[PDB]
């Protein structure tokens, strides 16, 4: 027989994610001395849609 579609999805030819217009990875900030002991502040500049 043939390789089935759920078996072809793992090769990543036409089943890769469409990621050109994505705005980046949504990650918290890296831990550091200031976050581990006190705090810092930031201004919320934008609220966007990816």
């Amino acid at each position: 027989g043939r390789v089935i579609r759920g078996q072809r999805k793992g090769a990543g030819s036409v089943f890769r994610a469409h990621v050109k217009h994505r705005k980046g990875a949504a990650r918290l900030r890296a831990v550091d001395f200031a976050e581990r002991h006190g705090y810092i502040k930031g201004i919320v500049k934008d609220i966007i849609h990816d």
């Binding site: 027989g1 043939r2 390789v3 089935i4 759920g6 078996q7």
Partner: protein, 49 residues
Amino acid sequence: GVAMNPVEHPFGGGNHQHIGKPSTIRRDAPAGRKVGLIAARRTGRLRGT
């Protein structure tokens, strides 16, 4: 899958569109055979919690 041909899905083929075999399968199935409800503990309409 039942709408395909047996060459290309373990569910296709037949003069009627029927599965012809149990949908539930063991977790230790090879790729190509592992389709349908995967290692289902329970199946059917949930009635309760």
